[PDB]
Amino acid sequence: SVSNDLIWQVIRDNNRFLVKRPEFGGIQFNREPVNVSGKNAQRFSGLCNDKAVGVQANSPRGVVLITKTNPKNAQKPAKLFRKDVIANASSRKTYKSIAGRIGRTGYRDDLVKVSVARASAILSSQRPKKTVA
Amino acid sequence: AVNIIKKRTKPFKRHQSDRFKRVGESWRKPRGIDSCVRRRFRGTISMPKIGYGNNKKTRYCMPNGLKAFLVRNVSDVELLLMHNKTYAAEIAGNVSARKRVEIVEKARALGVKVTNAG
Amino acid sequence: GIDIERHHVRKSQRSKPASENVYLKLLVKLYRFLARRTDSRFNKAILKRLFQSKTNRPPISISKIAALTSRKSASLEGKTTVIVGTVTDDERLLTVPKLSVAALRFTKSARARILKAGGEVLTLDQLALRAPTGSNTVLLRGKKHAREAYRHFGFGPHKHKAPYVRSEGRKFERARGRRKSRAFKV
Amino acid sequence: PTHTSKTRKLRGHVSAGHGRIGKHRKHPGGRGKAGGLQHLRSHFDKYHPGYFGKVGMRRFHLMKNPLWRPTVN
Amino acid sequence: AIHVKGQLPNAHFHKDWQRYVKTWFNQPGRKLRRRQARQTKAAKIAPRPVEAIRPAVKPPTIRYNMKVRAGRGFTLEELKAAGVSRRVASTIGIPVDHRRRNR
Amino acid sequence: MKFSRDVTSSRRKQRKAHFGAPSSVRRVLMSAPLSKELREQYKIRSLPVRRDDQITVIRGSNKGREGKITSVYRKKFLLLIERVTREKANGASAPVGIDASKVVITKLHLDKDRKDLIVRKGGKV
Amino acid sequence: TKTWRKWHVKVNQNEKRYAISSAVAASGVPSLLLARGHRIEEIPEVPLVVDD
Amino acid sequence: VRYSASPALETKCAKARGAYLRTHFKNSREVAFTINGMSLKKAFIFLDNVKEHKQAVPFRRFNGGVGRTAQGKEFGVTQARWPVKSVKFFYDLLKNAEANAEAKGLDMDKLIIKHVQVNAAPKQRRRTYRAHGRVTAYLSSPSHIEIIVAEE
RNA sequence: AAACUUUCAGCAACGGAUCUCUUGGCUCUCGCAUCGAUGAAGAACGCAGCGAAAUGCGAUACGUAAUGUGAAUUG
RNA sequence: GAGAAGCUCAGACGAGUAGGCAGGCGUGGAGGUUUGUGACGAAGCCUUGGGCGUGAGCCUGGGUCGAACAGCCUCUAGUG
RNA sequence: UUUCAAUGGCCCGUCUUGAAACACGGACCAAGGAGUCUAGCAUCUAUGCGAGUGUUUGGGUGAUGAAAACCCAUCCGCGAAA
RNA sequence: AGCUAAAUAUUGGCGAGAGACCGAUAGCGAACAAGUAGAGUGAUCGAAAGAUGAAAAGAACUUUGAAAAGAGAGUUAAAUAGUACGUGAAAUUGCUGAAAGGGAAGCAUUGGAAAUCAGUCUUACCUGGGUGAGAUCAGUAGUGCGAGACUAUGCAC
User: How many distinct structural domains can be found in chain F?
Assistant: First the structure.
């Protein structure tokens, strides 16, 4: 009846988190909070996949790990999403923590590299600006 | 995004647009029964053809190897967090100067190049 | 200059269904993999028929399924029947035998009668689960020319086809040109 | 809808798909199905045989209620 | 001229048919007006029944003689057999049909 | 959301009624809120404006200007208040019209009709 | 333009009921609500049923 | 008001203008072209000479069918005329510009006509009657004239 | 080399396109039934402190009686 | 993984009136969506600057301007 | 972008076997400007149901606020027999 | 020989509610003193024409001019809003600047000359490494049973 493939078929070309631009031959972006790669693909879409990973910018410093909980909570959106916050420590520690909580657990082995890259980008955006006046 | 080569740089101006002001420069396919341009006689203007199509790898790329992605707000700028080495932010013309300052600051923080900064 | 004849260059077959049914797209997605990764021609036939239009997928009745699977020289006792289309019910068949039928869709009466008669109804994905290569499956299709358009197609002199009339009876294309008493006959 | 019509694709083409020689003048072969015995005979006799003529006897004031008799097998 | 497949055209539009076009954009309005009218009639005649009692008759053709429908009014013979005068039947809401007879 | 079939939400009709209303309707249209103290005293949220009314401007350039309503220009939906003027080229004073909704009444011009209107609206005197 | 243009479109009652049933089933899917733009991140349960 | 150009010191220049002046636009243009760039006093002397037919205004652009005189050899042409109405309008405007310069306190010894321009004012329409009952336009061509004088 | 002509640009002209509005039009729906010899519809002539048009009015003339609101009309 | 409507490898071919088909660009209005743009300046307009697309066209810098306007998925037409 | 130099380049649309034609229309610019809607028919496609199919001729929730959405019975149209 | 409500019609009149309609060459001919101006003997024919500004605050006063007007001034957020008024295209025109021109001009390809525009890379991650302070890291180890993962806490200082 309702499956991940069915959900993707419904929302592939029409959903809130999809930004579609006819420029450059029809490019697309995915803004789902649980989509780390940023691409509009079913494998990378957090709205469908039971196990999904996302990386957001923590305030005022750090990153936030978004992990989908057990599929039995699919009908309970309040408990469906899990939030993890890292301390103000080294980027190497943050990448190691992300890899341990994503890959070494067997949750999403294909998303560890992109999750680390997104965390690196967020931290490299959060670092203080060397204003050359 | 390396060795970007354009087959043709001319804009394919419409026939007789240089002679008549009521005829715009936007290309129109000539469909006259005695159209020398349509028949492609020597010395006449060239018509756009599929062969003029640029390489798919270098298509839509600016001379710096990037693609000018239009952004209207900080949320639009955040879309290029991961695609920093392929897309460059272009601030929309209707964005106010107050919001443009925030857009520039966010693009600088994310490392995204701005095509029309300042 | 090259002198090459181009007659059968662009293929006239369907590579994908014209419909936007998401569930039909999922079935096509499954059977694309099946036909590509298996050497069985049954999977290729199912994939090709999944693209076909409604007029190219005529319905078949349970009575027709029973008649085809109960032939003396058939040896079809308890194997599955496969139809890429709709299975309708034939009320003239008062007693429905036990049949295993896989179809794209069933009518409510046909499904109820099949279930009551001890048979089973499966979809195409269930059929792929049971018989991935279509082994021991009776593949059938409905009568394509049973449509009303084919009794008019090919109309002409001495073709014995149905004309396009707005009514029926005399005073409607039953005069000169249709009998010897009025000039000529057909 | 209008945006899917062939008229949109014919914009910029002078003859609008009707030809430069024969054009799209008003009725050039008559109105309706007139001429079925003179200049439309090659179409009438080929696709609508039996159109012209009388066959059968008339029945004045036919009423179908006494003739109502649907059948069942 | 006729050169395409299909039945020959039979359109009856050789008059000024465009000046006698009947649209139905007032269909919901007419439905509401009729409902309001019958509600007003029900209120004004309460507690009398909205619809008067009608007889059961057989339609007059072989196509419909196997059915039973509602008639116009009860015959004089029926009223006499039931013990109701023709003058009092109208007062108490029993329609009287002087044309129908009981064969 | 309006529900009455006698109420029109048409912008065209609403503008026509507003800009074509006669003087009697325009009197009700040109209403000003009462001050906080007047609200407690009279239990009335607002009243139509009138001459000899003490008001203070709440909006516009002349904010915080106290004065008494000298005239009511219903044709232009304006109030001419005392000492609210601007200098012309030659040095004369041209009064500045203020919308009724932009001023708040601080002292009513009490009379028989005004008191009867307050009592009719259900307010203490 | 004429008034007798076909303003109204007729759809089979079965097709209408099919569409309504599909819409109800879609409303019961939390992912489709988020895709349509409803802020249901903190909703306790989908479908959301409240007391009488 | 806005003038066509002013690439000079605003404190050492004076301006004058006239709108909808019922004088020939073509004649005014020729007078303006002739008097452009000369000093104010010499311009006044030249305008007086044109009044007295001692000097003529050359016609360089609108010279179709203009007669020839010996007074055009000063400017190197053959076609020259004496537009009295245009000269008087220019004389009045130059006098107004001189008055403005006097009010500004500028040095009235190095005053040179730095800018002068004539534009076509909206045409006033009249009717002329032709053969076979025809009515035809009889329009006028008034001029907008602006003059700027400045120190040399 | 000037003048002249042509092309472009900047200002100044001619002209009123584009954009945005709209007490207007068009269409649909709902409700109602009321002209006149007790002088209708229409026409003419007049009526205001300063009034030709429109609105209103008729020598009681931008109107009187009566009722309602309650400080204005406005150039 | 690569918007499976995706990714990848290889070969051949390319004139075109009348005409046929497909995919796209642009305009007005409607539904949904984009903590969408905007008096710290929307639309429009000018431009001797820049960028993209084979092209229909689009984005942008600089001026003028003053109040509304747009991207995406569909619907629709008095749409070039 | 302008201009120069070399080479090439006839005025567009239209009827036509054939137009640069000594064939016709066109001085210039702005705005407007021409396969639309309806009653049918034929093919193809999509959807729903299926020996059935078609709720909107009509009636009810109706009063709310309801030209909508939703529900409801007998006929009837087409098909099931020529 | 005759009467009779209801269900039915309604591009006229009156009142009301709306619109996937038109946004001033559109929509009624008429958004504006429109069946008005105007034409014809007459029957009849029949237009064009909306927008300053929030508010006239509609430019006091001086000076030149016979005057119209101009220049100074002044109001306003704006006079690049002055009633010839929202913005203000094109055709066409004037001045200025640049360039070219021996009975056409315009265009296409290539390049020269002149003018003009962008490319800020040596941001950022990281190897080596001089000065510098610092709640000190993995390995350990204690804290839902085996085991991979991690927050917090004492040793490791």
Answer: 1
